[PDB]
Amino acid sequence: MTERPDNVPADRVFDFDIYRDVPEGLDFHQSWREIMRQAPHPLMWTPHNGGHWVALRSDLAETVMSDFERFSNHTVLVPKETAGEAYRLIPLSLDPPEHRPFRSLLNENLGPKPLRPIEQVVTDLAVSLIEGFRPKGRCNFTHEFAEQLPVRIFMRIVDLPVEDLPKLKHLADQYTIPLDDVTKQFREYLRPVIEARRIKPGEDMISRMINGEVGGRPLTDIEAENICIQVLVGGLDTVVNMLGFTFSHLAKDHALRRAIAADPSLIDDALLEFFRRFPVVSSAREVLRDQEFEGVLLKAGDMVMAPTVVVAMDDARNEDPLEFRLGRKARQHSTFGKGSHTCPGAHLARMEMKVVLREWFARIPEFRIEDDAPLRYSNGIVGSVKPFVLEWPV
Ligand code: HEM
């Protein structure tokens, strides 16, 4: 809905809304592939959401994703002058070199070692939820299962009392009640906990960050609060939506479902193919300087969207990427991004998927979409299958 600027050839104009639903009834990733296939250039421009460029080829997307010297994490959301400014929060908004010490802190604290006890936490939660609805023979998977996981897991990582789950779920939902008021509510909740752990440190992630340094100086309360929020939100819709694609797929692909049920040792490799097959995140970058790129002039202040989606779905760099194959000898993808801002929660994401797949298949080996209804999907910063119902015998 914005005026076409003088740095945008009309040859690169296309009708793209990252918030608009997938047309009923294409497959989410198929839809994207058609957008990629119809586009006259690898880099197109859309009047929607402030007006912004979109990288529509794999190599291009990964370049914008990773080349911080030209494309900055200063704004990552569209529209830039509403959502982009609204959600800009250090250190995720930082570029290298400044982003370096924070990246280290994020990556080490969400690593395999300090997340070791989380595995039994995910196991007990998954089991309790599944045993809950198993005798009903049906469930809304997104509301009754997927959505019940990430806040509870976050809360065990940072060691917060389970009584606070509804409060925290409500804040995270309303964050993603004016926004600035939600952030204040986040800090009013988190600051006493951080201050309590400065006095009596434990082994949780807040205590670990507190006893860490970045510039050779301690973290401030502001920085630790920012990181807590970003870690809570960062693993919420991502994990819920990923689980949605995974289980709606299993529901349809009976060949795959029956193999995994009859042989759970397939889960480790199936997992790797679920992360390749179903990229969900579309992040963007801000242009800081006038730059010649892709045969056009990128003005300073321009936004460039670089979806993880266009990476693994590019058939000029991937073999039949819509096909779900356990056989795959090559599985390159950027579902977790590329560059300094590569997802530090990727280990947690894979641990969660594994436990969920293992406990689900132990208990409900055979299931499908109720009445084998068609899937419908949404786009956004995190893509999704709209809420679906699963059914199983007894
Ligand atoms: C299937 C699950 C997940 C997917 C697909 C995913 C995807 C991504 C992507 C694409 C990025 C890069 C954003 C960019 O280009 O700037 C990212 C970063 C990030 N993720 Fe994840 N994520 C997942 C799970 C998680 C979890 C479980 C956590 C936390 C426990 C988490 C926390 C974060 C944080 C804090 C960042 C920001 C890194 C930085 O900018 O320094 N994510 N994620």
- Which DSSP string do the residues of 281-343 spell out, in sequence order? BEEEEEE-S-EEETTEEE-TT-EEEEETHHHHT-TTTSSSTTS--TT-S-----TT--STT--
Is the torsion defined by CA of 274, 275, 279, 282 positive or negative? positive
Contact status, residue 261 vs residue 365, Cβ threshold 8 Å: yes
CA nearest neighbour of 77 among 382, 384, 337, 332: 382
Ligand 1 site-directed mutation target among 77, 237, 343, most atoms within 8 Å of CB: 343
Q: What are the backbone dihedrals phi and psi of residue 291, each rounded to the nearest 5 degrees, phi first?
A: -140, 135
Say how far apart CA 155 and CA 172 lie, in whole Å.
12
Residue 152: HSE in the Cβ half-sphere, 13 Å Cα cutoff: 17
Say how far apart CA 193 and CA 206 lie, in whole Å.
8
Three-state DSSP at 150 gives helix
Say how far apart CA 205 and CA 282 lie, in whole Å.
27
For this entry, resolution in Å reads 1.8
Strands 296-298 and 282-287: unpaired
Domains, the chain, in order of start with CATH, read 1-394 (1.10.630.10)
Q: Give distance in angstroms: CA of 37 to centre of ligand 1.
A: 28
What single string gives the DSSP state of each residue in 62-80?
HHHHH-TTTEETT--SSSI
Is the torsion defined by CA of 303, 305, 306, 308 positive or negative? positive
Say how far apart CA 182 and CA 171 lie, in whole Å.
6
What angle in degrees, to the nearest 10, is found between the helix axes of 221-234 and 165-175? 80
Q: Give distance in angstroms: CA of 258 to centre of ligand 1.
A: 31
Say how far apart CA 268 and CA 355 lie, in whole Å.
10
User: Omega before 25 cis (within 30°)?
Assistant: yes
Say how far apart CA 246 and CA 359 lie, in whole Å.
14
Task: Report whether residue 349 contacts ligand 1, using a CB cutoff of 6 Å.
Answer: yes
**Bridge partner residues of 384 (DSSP):** 378
Task: Report whether residue 337 contacts ligand 1, using a CB cutoff of 6 Å.
Answer: yes
Position 90, amino acid: I
Angle at CA of residue 331, ends 327 and 44, nearest 5°: 130
Angle at CA of residue 21, ends 2 and 373, nearest 5°: 170
C-alpha distances in Å from residue 171, one per residue of 182, 236, 338 = 6, 12, 29
Say how far apart CA 64 and CA 392 lie, in whole Å.
44
**Bridge partner residues of 307 (DSSP):** 282
Q: Which helix (H) or strand (E) holds 247?
A: helix 237-252
Position 143, amino acid: H
Say how far apart CA 332 and CA 180 lie, in whole Å.
39
Q: Give distance in angstroms: CA of 230 to centre of ligand 1.
A: 9
Cβ burial of 331 (10 Å; 0-12, 13-18, 19+) is: middle
CA nearest neighbour of 151 among 380, 352, 374: 352
Cβ burial of 269 (10 Å; 0-12, 13-18, 19+) is: middle
Contact status, residue 122 vs residue 208, Cβ threshold 8 Å: no
Q: Residue 378 is encoded by which pair of tokens? A: 């949404």
* 67: CB partners within 8 A, 6+ apart: 339
Q: Give distance in angstroms: CA of 94 to centre of ligand 1.
A: 15
Contact status, residue 24 vs residue 373, Cβ threshold 8 Å: no
Task: Report whether residue 231 contacts ligand 1, using a CB cutoff of 6 Å.
Answer: yes
CA nearest neighbour of 78 among 57, 54, 56, 52: 52
What single string gives the DSSP state of each residue in 183-213?
HHHHHHHHHHHHHHHHHS--SSHHHHHHT--
Angle at CA of residue 188, ends 186 and 190, nearest 5°: 65
**Bridge partner residues of 14 (DSSP):** none
Task: Report whether residue 353 contacts ligand 1, using a CB cutoff of 6 Å.
Answer: no
C-alpha distances in Å from residue 357, one per residue of 10, 250, 268, 362, 364 = 47, 10, 9, 8, 10
Q: Give distance in angstroms: CA of 236 to centre of ligand 1.
A: 10
Contact status, residue 139 vs residue 154, Cβ threshold 8 Å: no
Task: Report whether residue 12 contacts ligand 1, using a CB cutoff of 6 Å.
Answer: no
Contact status, residue 381 vs residue 308, Cβ threshold 8 Å: no
Resolved by: X-ray
